[PDB]
Amino acid sequence: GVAAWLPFARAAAIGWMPVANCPMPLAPADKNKRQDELIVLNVSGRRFQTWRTTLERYPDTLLGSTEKEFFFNEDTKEYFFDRDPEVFRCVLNFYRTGKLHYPRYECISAYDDELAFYGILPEIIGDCCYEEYKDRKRENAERL
Amino acid sequence: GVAAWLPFARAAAIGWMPVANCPMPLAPADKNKRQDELIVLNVSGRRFQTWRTTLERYPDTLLGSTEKEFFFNEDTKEYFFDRDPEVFRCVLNFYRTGKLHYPRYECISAYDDELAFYGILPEIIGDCCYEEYKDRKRENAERLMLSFRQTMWRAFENPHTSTLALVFYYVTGFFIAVSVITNVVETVPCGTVPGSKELPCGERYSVAFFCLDTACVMIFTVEYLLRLFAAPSRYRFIRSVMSIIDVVAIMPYYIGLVMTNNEDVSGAFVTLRVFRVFRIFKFSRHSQGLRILGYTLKSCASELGFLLFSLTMAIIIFATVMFYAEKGSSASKFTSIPASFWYTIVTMTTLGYGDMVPKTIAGKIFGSICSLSGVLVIALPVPVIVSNFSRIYHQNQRADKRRAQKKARLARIRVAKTGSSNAYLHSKRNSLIESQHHHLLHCLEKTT
Amino acid sequence: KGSSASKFTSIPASFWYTIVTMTTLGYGDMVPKTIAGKIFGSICSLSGVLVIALPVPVIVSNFSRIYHQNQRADKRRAQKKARLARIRVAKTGSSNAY
Amino acid sequence: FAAPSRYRFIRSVMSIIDVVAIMPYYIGLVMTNNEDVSGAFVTLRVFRVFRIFKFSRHSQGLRILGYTLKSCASELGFLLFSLTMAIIIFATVMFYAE
Amino acid sequence: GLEQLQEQTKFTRKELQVLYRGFKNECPSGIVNEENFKQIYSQFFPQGDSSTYATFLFNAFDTNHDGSVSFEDFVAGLSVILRGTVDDRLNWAFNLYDLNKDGCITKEEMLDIMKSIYDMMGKYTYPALREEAPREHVESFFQKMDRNKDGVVTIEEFIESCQKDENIMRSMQLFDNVI
């Protein structure tokens, strides 16, 4: 999540080097690094777009993993998901900020289906809108 | 904001030039000017588009400033914001019209976060939809909001800490009960005693009850002193209501035995015995409902004030009318306007004891109107009181439940941080980002 | 306590009056005759009204809620058979197409 | 003397209340016991209580009460009508049965 | 502005855009108060306590003595560390160590910073944990970097003494490779 202040932490590590009278400082961990690029998520014709460093913030889900390579087209350079394009927005905004919201106008069953597809768990819904999620899910359960 | 009528104002300035007999008119302020163009805001893949003169209407925000040049790409000619594309529409429509709206279906926290990002302040939300913004924000806020002395202060203010606290609580909630039952029973006239006068049990077995209430009041005063010794702010405690209750429940016995029948007139000890019932309020510590009742009686005191006022007004009105309509009768008990208060308060509450009933046509008509009037003037505060009670109860419920789940998410977060530290220790025993973080930690390992 | 033929002979014997006054019943076989008795009976009546008015909304709301819950439960159990009929009709149609 | 529209003021309700609260004393002392029969001064003393409505200027709740009594007069009309109807019905039945 | 920052700092324009997007993403326009700074560090140092050292260098980055750090405060400090000369990095380090900014470091001033860095290792260190051992580290430092012999190191005292070493000079070129 916090990866854009890592240069700042490395620069802050300057305070230790003069007091590092211990002989050896560790050799740097430099590897091949490539810039951020805009990747294009083509969800049901609707085109979302984001830095890939945004999606690599949660590597235990469909979009942060290599599972999404099952949905890539090398000829069009886009990921195509044949899913609902109105709930994918909440997933993308979870990847961006860090809190998962619940649109009050959405059917609870469609929301649960999309969360199950993308690998998100309903347990990490933000506290801002989590009582109403539980309300609607309770009502849906007792109705079905 | 108003910049498209500026040519019109310049053209209107023609009226001054002939009357500008003042010699010099100021030279024009002509500078390099370039046309409006459509600029393309690429918000999360969704392309918005607008004249840049639309965005330069508010130059104290992110889009009206030069700050947005941090988001420009010269190779694609577009501004890219990696933000939510559904709240950006409200920001753009604020730049266009001039009023900022609030989509009723949007989470208030996401809305506030986007407004904070773009430099807009929630204070300029249009009046059209601003009460509901405040409603949702209030609801969101309220939804998201020593080993000897302080340990016993933690035990007192939370009886469910240890089983020692549970036993102490269940034994202080027993002498209250036994004292209440004793004060009730001491008046029961029992025992025929065919040899002497018929007396109540309380004065027949005088010392038997002296033992009981002395034990009770000693326990009460010692537990009060313990509350005092554990009170961190020993002046905030004295000002509390339960402190007053305990003081006024214990003192009717001290004041009682200091001025015992060595100097006694019967018209002054019944007051000391009436006050002895106020120790039944000590159950406030044991039942949450009895505390919610006080909280709701205090939350809606503005309604009880009007209740008392309208009630006494209606009482005076109907007592006057009933007295003058019923004054002259055979054995009329409506002897006075104060004496007609009784009837009226017995009629407005739909009690109807029947010891005072009218006997004239006017008396009957006005009693019949008094009953309905009392019904309607007492029916006003009851919905408010019961609604406040249920509201506060369901508020406390959700408060405790949220305080429960907060610990769950704290557990989640420090579990995650433990997992990260274990991942570091694992990589030390031999993913393109954690490499540099682990290297930073390794550089720190200079410390030894 | 002190009156001509006072029927308030005891604090238990005064329970009757109070429960007859808090419920707005008012039989009238026990009525106060002193100014303090009248004042406190007049306060007792309103106090009883307000302390009995607390559980009634909860009880009636729960009753209506459970009734309208059973209604919808039976209606949904009705339509479930309809959709099961739909599905095995469709599968019969597929077998007939084969 | 401060009323801008001194005819809109007279037509107001508080003006009527003040007039009918003050006049039971004027009308009272003009026709004092120089000419008096006991059946006519109790009416002048009953009207003397209507000055308690002068508290309308002081308590906002007492004005909201009038505003809501005027806003829902269509319901009070039906209340009076249905009450009279039921009273007549049940009084007839009870009289003939008793 | 993007251009005044293009000229004030040794950074390029794309490197300024990346840093600004990250910075504002982590703290949008409520730029930073001294408490959120420490909460941002807290993500990089598990197994330890970093609040004291965070507070120590928050005032180093706060060029003016306002209550907050802006983006120019952030980026000028990053440039003077990641792109400046070795002398500039050493001046930044010394000004961090010297607390009252008088020009001289006494044993208390650097003792505080040594305790602060030691607190970051956390609860358990694999070898022993002492207090006179941080005192010994302060002693070894004052040994290596002082000719005054008055228990006080100064700006030139630290500059000329910190240059002659070898391993720390190979260390202070770590900040040039990855940026």
Side-chain angles (χ1 to χ4, degrees), chain A, chain B, chain C, chain D, chain E residues 1-178:
Chain A
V2 181
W5 287 66
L6 196 151
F8 181 70
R10 289 166 148 258
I14 195 165
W16 320 332
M17 300 330 176
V19 312
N21 290 319
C22 180
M24 182 178 176
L26 277 302
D30 183 19
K31 291 172 70 175
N32 51 3
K33 189 66 65 187
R34 75 282 190 193
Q35 290 181 322
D36 277 329
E37 62 167 359
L38 288 176
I39 77 180
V40 176
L41 288 305
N42 183 0
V43 177
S44 176
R46 177 149 150 78
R47 170 181 77 102
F48 301 85
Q49 212 160 5
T50 187
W51 313 103
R52 71 168 151 73
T53 193
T54 302
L55 291 182
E56 74 189 38
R57 280 182 46 182
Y58 297 92
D60 59 354
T61 51
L62 194 148
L63 293 171
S65 172
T66 67
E67 167 176 19
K68 69 178 175 295
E69 309 292 331
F70 283 107
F71 302 85
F72 188 80
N73 296 333
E74 282 80 1
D75 50 356
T76 73
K77 296 279 97 175
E78 305 179 358
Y79 300 81
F80 183 77
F81 302 89
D82 196 356
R83 312 286 307 172
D84 166 71
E86 284 304 320
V87 179
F88 183 83
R89 200 189 43 96
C90 299
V91 175
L92 204 48
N93 295 337
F94 158 76
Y95 274 90
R96 295 182 168 125
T97 76
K99 54 190 62 59
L100 174 74
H101 294 285
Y102 171 71
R104 288 134 181 76
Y105 59 86
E106 189 77 15
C107 189
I108 195 74
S109 163
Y111 195 80
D112 286 314
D113 294 9
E114 296 286 297
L115 291 188
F117 181 89
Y118 290 106
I120 319 294
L121 288 171
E123 300 297 328
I124 70 190
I125 300 195
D127 271 353
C128 57
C129 54
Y130 178 73
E131 286 60 29
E132 187 169 0
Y133 171 76
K134 287 306 298 167
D135 185 325
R136 300 278 202 283
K137 196 190 207 162
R138 166 179 305 117
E139 194 279 332
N140 184 256
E142 64 91 9
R143 151 197 302 162
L144 316 183
Chain B
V2 181
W5 287 67
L6 196 151
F8 180 70
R10 289 166 148 259
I14 195 165
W16 320 332
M17 300 330 177
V19 313
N21 304 258
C22 181
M24 182 178 176
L26 277 302
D30 183 19
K31 291 171 70 175
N32 51 3
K33 189 66 65 187
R34 75 282 190 193
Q35 290 182 322
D36 277 329
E37 62 168 359
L38 288 176
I39 76 181
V40 176
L41 288 305
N42 183 0
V43 177
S44 176
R46 177 149 150 78
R47 170 181 77 102
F48 301 85
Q49 212 160 6
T50 188
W51 313 104
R52 70 168 151 73
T53 193
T54 301
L55 290 190
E56 74 189 39
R57 278 169 212 195
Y58 298 92
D60 58 354
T61 52
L62 194 148
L63 293 172
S65 173
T66 70
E67 167 176 19
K68 69 177 175 295
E69 309 292 331
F70 283 107
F71 302 85
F72 188 80
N73 296 333
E74 283 80 1
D75 50 356
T76 73
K77 297 280 98 175
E78 307 182 355
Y79 300 81
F80 183 77
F81 302 89
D82 196 357
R83 314 283 309 170
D84 167 70
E86 285 303 320
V87 178
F88 183 83
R89 200 188 43 97
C90 299
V91 175
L92 204 48
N93 295 337
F94 158 76
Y95 275 90
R96 295 182 168 125
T97 76
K99 54 190 62 59
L100 174 75
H101 294 285
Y102 172 71
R104 289 134 180 76
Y105 59 86
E106 189 77 15
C107 189
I108 195 74
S109 162
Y111 194 80
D112 285 313
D113 297 335
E114 296 285 296
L115 289 193
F117 182 89
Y118 290 106
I120 319 293
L121 272 153
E123 300 297 328
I124 69 191
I125 300 195
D127 272 353
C128 57
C129 54
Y130 178 72
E131 286 60 29
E132 186 169 0
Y133 171 75
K134 286 306 298 167
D135 185 325
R136 300 277 203 283
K137 196 190 207 162
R138 166 180 305 117
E139 198 291 328
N140 184 257
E142 64 91 8
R143 152 197 303 162
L144 316 183
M145 187 65 205
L146 62 87
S147 171
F148 176 78
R149 158 202 193 88
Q150 297 188 1
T151 196
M152 65 160 43
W153 183 251
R154 286 185 278 247
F156 284 166
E157 295 295 327
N158 187 10
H160 276 175
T161 48
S162 177
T163 62
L164 190 148
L166 269 80
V167 165
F168 168 73
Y169 158 75
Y170 283 147
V171 65
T172 187
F174 177 83
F175 293 110
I176 303 170
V178 71
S179 84
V180 161
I181 299 179
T182 303
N183 302 310
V184 160
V185 171
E186 81 173 2
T187 56
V188 183
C190 183
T192 182
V193 182
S196 79
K197 175 65 205 93
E198 177 52 71
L199 302 180
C201 279
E203 86 178 44
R204 182 181 171 185
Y205 314 143
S206 172
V207 288
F209 289 114
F210 201 83
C211 165
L212 278 150
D213 51 12
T214 42
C216 294
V217 70
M218 289 315 215
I219 292 152
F220 288 146
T221 191
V222 68
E223 68 93 21
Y224 175 56
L225 292 174
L226 290 203
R227 302 303 294 250
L228 204 46
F229 193 82
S233 175
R234 290 191 202 189
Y235 190 76
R236 287 332 296 165
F237 167 91
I238 298 298
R239 205 166 277 260
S240 66
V241 292
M242 291 181 183
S243 62
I244 297 169
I245 285 163
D246 300 9
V247 172
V248 307
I250 61 171
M251 56 193 277
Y253 164 70
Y254 294 155
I255 312 165
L257 87 161
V258 184
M259 277 73 75
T260 318
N261 299 165
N262 316 88
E263 44 267 10
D264 167 79
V265 177
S266 172
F269 72 96
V270 310
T271 303
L272 292 173
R273 299 200 106 94
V274 163
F275 271 98
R276 208 157 71 227
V277 79
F278 292 174
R279 63 186 49 158
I280 202 178
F281 291 102
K282 287 180 184 166
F283 276 113
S284 316
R285 313 206 152 104
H286 301 54
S287 64
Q288 165 205 5
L290 211 62
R291 288 188 298 269
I292 297 176
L293 199 148
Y295 296 160
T296 186
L297 276 186
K298 188 42 74 181
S299 67
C300 67
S302 177
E303 271 68 1
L304 277 71
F306 180 69
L307 165 65
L308 179 80
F309 178 64
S310 53
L311 200 67
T312 187
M313 181 181 288
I315 285 184
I316 294 157
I317 294 173
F318 283 105
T320 316
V321 186
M322 289 290 320
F323 167 68
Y324 276 129
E326 206 80 29
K327 185 202 174 316
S329 283
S330 73
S332 192
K333 303 176 74 170
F334 293 80
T335 63
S336 181
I337 288 187
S340 297
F341 290 159
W342 186 225
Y343 172 85
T344 301
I345 196 52
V346 166
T347 293
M348 286 173 66
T349 47
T350 56
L351 204 56
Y353 286 123
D355 52 336
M356 289 171 71
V357 296
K359 287 190 301 283
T360 72
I361 313 288
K364 302 202 183 179
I365 292 166
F366 287 121
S368 298
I369 306 175
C370 167
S371 62
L372 301 162
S373 298
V375 163
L376 68 88
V377 308
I378 305 185
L380 295 180
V382 163
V384 191
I385 287 182
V386 307
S387 67
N388 277 120
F389 188 89
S390 67
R391 162 188 78 78
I392 293 181
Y393 182 75
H394 295 170
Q395 174 159 350
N396 277 16
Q397 285 295 138
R398 87 186 156 190
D400 66 63
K401 188 262 288 182
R402 298 179 294 95
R403 197 169 311 152
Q405 70 180 357
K406 181 249 287 188
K407 289 319 157 178
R409 64 179 47 201
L410 258 68
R412 182 150 66 214
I413 67 169
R414 91 282 196 276
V415 159
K417 87 182 293 182
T418 289
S420 68
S421 161
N422 288 320
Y424 164 57
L425 282 171
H426 180 197
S427 294
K428 199 172 204 164
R429 294 160 212 157
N430 313 323
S431 69
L432 80 93
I433 280 291
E434 58 80 21
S435 43
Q436 319 194 32
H437 184 208
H438 291 71
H439 163 238
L440 193 152
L441 271 299
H442 210 173
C443 289
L444 172 58
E445 304 272 34
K446 167 264 302 178
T447 187
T448 303
Chain C
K1 184 201 176 316
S3 283
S4 73
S6 192
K7 303 176 74 170
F8 293 80
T9 63
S10 181
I11 288 187
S14 282
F15 290 159
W16 186 224
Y17 172 84
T18 301
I19 196 52
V20 167
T21 294
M22 287 173 67
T23 46
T24 54
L25 204 56
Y27 286 123
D29 52 337
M30 288 171 74
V31 296
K33 287 190 300 282
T34 72
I35 312 288
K38 302 201 182 179
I39 292 166
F40 286 120
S42 299
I43 305 174
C44 166
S45 62
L46 301 162
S47 298
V49 162
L50 69 88
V51 308
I52 305 185
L54 295 180
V56 163
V58 191
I59 287 183
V60 307
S61 67
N62 277 119
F63 188 89
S64 67
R65 162 188 78 78
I66 293 181
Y67 183 75
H68 295 169
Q69 173 159 351
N70 277 16
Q71 285 294 139
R72 87 186 156 189
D74 67 63
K75 188 262 288 182
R76 299 179 295 95
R77 196 169 311 152
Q79 63 86 30
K80 181 248 286 188
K81 289 319 156 178
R83 64 179 47 201
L84 258 68
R86 183 150 66 214
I87 67 169
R88 91 282 196 276
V89 159
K91 87 182 293 182
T92 289
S94 67
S95 164
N96 289 320
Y98 164 57
Chain D
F1 193 81
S5 175
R6 290 191 202 189
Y7 190 76
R8 286 332 296 165
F9 167 91
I10 298 298
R11 205 166 277 260
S12 66
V13 293
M14 299 197 187
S15 62
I16 297 169
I17 285 163
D18 300 9
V19 172
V20 307
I22 61 171
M23 55 191 266
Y25 164 71
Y26 294 155
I27 312 164
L29 87 161
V30 184
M31 277 73 75
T32 317
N33 299 165
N34 319 88
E35 44 266 11
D36 165 81
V37 177
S38 172
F41 73 97
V42 304
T43 303
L44 292 174
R45 300 201 106 95
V46 164
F47 272 98
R48 208 157 71 227
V49 79
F50 292 174
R51 64 186 48 158
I52 202 178
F53 291 103
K54 287 180 184 166
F55 277 112
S56 297
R57 314 207 151 104
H58 300 54
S59 63
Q60 165 205 5
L62 208 64
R63 288 188 299 269
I64 298 176
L65 200 149
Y67 296 159
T68 186
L69 276 187
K70 188 41 74 180
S71 67
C72 67
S74 177
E75 272 69 1
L76 263 46
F78 180 69
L79 165 65
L80 179 80
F81 177 63
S82 51
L83 205 67
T84 303
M85 183 176 175
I87 285 183
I88 295 158
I89 294 172
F90 283 105
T92 315
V93 186
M94 289 290 320
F95 167 69
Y96 276 129
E98 206 80 29
Chain E
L2 184 47
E3 314 305 317
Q4 52 195 47
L5 260 51
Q6 267 279 95
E7 61 90 18
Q8 284 184 16
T9 71
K10 277 81 153 197
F11 288 117
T12 63
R13 200 183 59 97
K14 294 189 169 41
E15 284 167 15
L16 272 189
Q17 291 184 340
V18 170
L19 269 67
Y20 185 78
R21 301 179 310 195
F23 179 92
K24 191 168 176 65
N25 174 31
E26 204 69 21
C27 45
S29 180
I31 44 177
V32 276
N33 44 4
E34 196 267 340
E35 192 272 355
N36 291 314
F37 196 99
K38 316 185 291 190
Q39 190 271 329
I40 292 309
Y41 274 179
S42 296
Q43 304 324 92
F44 296 120
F45 304 96
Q47 78 181 1
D49 167 79
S50 52
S51 296
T52 302
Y53 186 56
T55 302
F56 263 96
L57 85 164
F58 177 94
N59 297 105
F61 268 99
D62 215 348
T63 170
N64 46 0
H65 219 301
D66 308 334
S68 67
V69 169
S70 72
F71 184 69
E72 60 268 13
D73 310 319
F74 177 90
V75 75
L78 282 199
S79 69
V80 78
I81 294 186
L82 297 198
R83 294 285 193 270
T85 75
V86 177
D87 174 275
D88 305 329
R89 288 151 164 178
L90 289 173
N91 292 147
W92 203 92
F94 180 90
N95 292 296
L96 172 61
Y97 295 150
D98 184 18
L99 291 200
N100 49 1
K101 317 304 178 315
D102 49 17
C104 63
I105 308 172
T106 46
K107 189 170 287 294
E108 59 179 0
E109 282 169 348
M110 196 172 179
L111 187 150
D112 293 331
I113 288 141
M114 201 62 68
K115 269 68 181 172
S116 317
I117 180 60
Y118 269 114
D119 298 355
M120 210 174 307
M121 200 53 222
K123 172 257 304 174
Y124 91 96
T125 307
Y126 318 93
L129 296 85
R130 279 87 51 81
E131 285 65 21
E132 282 297 322
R135 265 78 186 279
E136 289 135 30
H137 197 193
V138 175
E139 291 293 329
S140 67
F141 199 97
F142 267 74
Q143 179 65 258
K144 273 193 183 182
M145 312 211 184
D146 200 357
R147 287 106 172 96
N148 282 36
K149 311 298 187 171
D150 316 289
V152 166
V153 295
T154 74
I155 181 173
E156 67 285 338
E157 200 51 50
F158 173 59
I159 283 160
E160 270 86 343
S161 51
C162 192
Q163 161 69 239
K164 70 187 179 301
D165 202 325
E166 179 64 27
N167 66 321
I168 75 176
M169 291 287 99
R170 192 261 162 200
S171 191
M172 208 162 285
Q173 72 204 20
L174 266 168
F175 308 130
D176 285 87
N177 311 319
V178 177

